[PDB]
Design a protein around this motif. Sequence first.
Motif: not given
Length: 134
Positions: A25-29, A50-51, A89-90, A92-97
């Motif tokens: 998930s580092w791209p979104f940190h 996320l920051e 990337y999407t 991974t973003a879906q897993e974050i959501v």
Amino acid sequence: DDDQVAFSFILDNIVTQKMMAVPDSWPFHHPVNKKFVPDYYKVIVNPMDLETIRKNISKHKYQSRESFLDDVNLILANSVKYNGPESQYTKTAQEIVNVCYQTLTEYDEHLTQLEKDICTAKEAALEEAELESL
Ligand SMILES: C=CCCn1cc(-c2cccc(C(=O)N3CCOCC3)c2)c2cc[nH]c2c1=O
């Protein structure tokens, strides 16, 4: 009355312990640096990361799960726009959501009560300020 601090504590721990722990998930940190992704801001007009969400929580921006989830969803929507709906990337973003929604359910009753109580106090403080001014 520590309702806002307690509400923000729950959201911050979902971000750090669950959302940031999603593998890869580092791209979104952190916000995108245009020196690393030159075209990013040419496409994405309402950036989010996320920051930034953690800075917003620290400033008590969110008084509801819906407002917090608006910023969480903006990350997913931005990846669909920039990378496409099928990009890794999407995914991974879906897993974050999804981990965000799942973890929030663990606090459903408490968050429901905190949102109601924060609202009641906000309304009472507003009325008091109006009466003091007149
Ligand atoms: C917050 C949402 C952005 C998510 N995202 C991130 C990057 C990417 C790739 C390499 C470096 C960077 C970058 O600027 N960094 C690293 C992280 O820390 C800040 C500086 C970003 C990228 C490349 C193509 N699509 C994306 C993308 O959708």
